Amino acid sequence: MSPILGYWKIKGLVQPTRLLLEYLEEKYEEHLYERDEGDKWRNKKFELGLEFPNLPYYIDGDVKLTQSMAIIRYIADKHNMLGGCPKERAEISMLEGAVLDIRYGVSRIAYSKDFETLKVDFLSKLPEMLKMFEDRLCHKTYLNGDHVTHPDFMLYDALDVVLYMDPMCLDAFPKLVCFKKRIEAIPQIDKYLKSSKYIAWPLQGWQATFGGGDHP
């Protein structure tokens, strides 16, 4: 029985997890809830055996999990990708948080009716955040070295998003522009992005002022 990954039919908080699964060439099925299926989900919420019911969820022969970060880390952990010692594991967790500051930075304002005003102060702070990654990649191929790790897919997802907000936010960051291409040059990812499973939009929930709607 193939693992089930439930979530809205958007990119949201699970996009990075989808990408890690594709990368590892893991098999899995998806329980996607359409914009109007809110009710279809509420009637199942407390019937799946989840100790902490929420979206996304991940169910397979071994576990039943919720909290998108617990899920991506589990899939990575099952492939010995979380780090070989305390120090390395803390390096990888530091990369997770730094990426989330960016990604969550967008979500916290993408639902306000004053998006444009908020979008201005945000983009004034985004640069400092990007440059930390720009330097981290000065001599590395990927965030943790020569081998891909899950924070790589999270960062990719964050760049894909801040680029919709502002197509020029990476002009001063060549290594990040390259990092983004390099992730797409990975065989498994390129296949996925061109397959029928890829969900290109929306970025956030359909009702958001930014990254919302049924079409780009």
Ligand X SMILES: N[C@@H](CCC(=O)N[C@@H](CSCc1ccccc1I)C(=O)NCC(=O)O)C(=O)O
**Is residue 53 helix, strand or coil?**
coil
Q: Pick between residue 179 and residue 192 the one whose CB is nearest to a second copy.
A: 179
Q: Which of residues 95-134 bind ligand X (CB under 6 A)?
A: 97, 101, 107
Q: Does 211 bind ligand X (CB under 6 A)?
A: no
Secondary structure of 23-41 as H, E, C letters: HCCCCCEEEEECHHHHHHH
The nearest distance, CB 187 to ligand X, in angstroms, is 29
Residue 52 CA to residue 46 CA, distance in Å, equals 9
Q: Is 108 exposed, middle or buried (0-12, 13-18, 19+ CB in 10 A)?
A: exposed
Query: Is 201 one of the annotated binding-site residues?
Result: no
181 makes contact, choosing from ligand X, a second copy, none, with CB < 5 to 8 Å by partner type, with none
74 makes contact, choosing from ligand X, a second copy, none, with CB < 5 to 8 Å by partner type, with a second copy
The nearest distance, CB 77 to a second copy, in angstroms, is 5
> Per the structure block, which two tokens stand in for 177?
């522009």
Q: Which of 55, 123, 177, 199 binds ligand X (CB under 6 A)?
A: 55
Task: Judge whether 176 and 98 are in contact, CB under 8 Å.
Answer: no
The nearest distance, CB 46 to a second copy, in angstroms, is 10
Query: Is 67 one of the annotated binding-site residues?
Result: yes
Residue 65 CA to residue 182 CA, distance in Å, equals 31
The nearest distance, CB 70 to a second copy, in angstroms, is 4
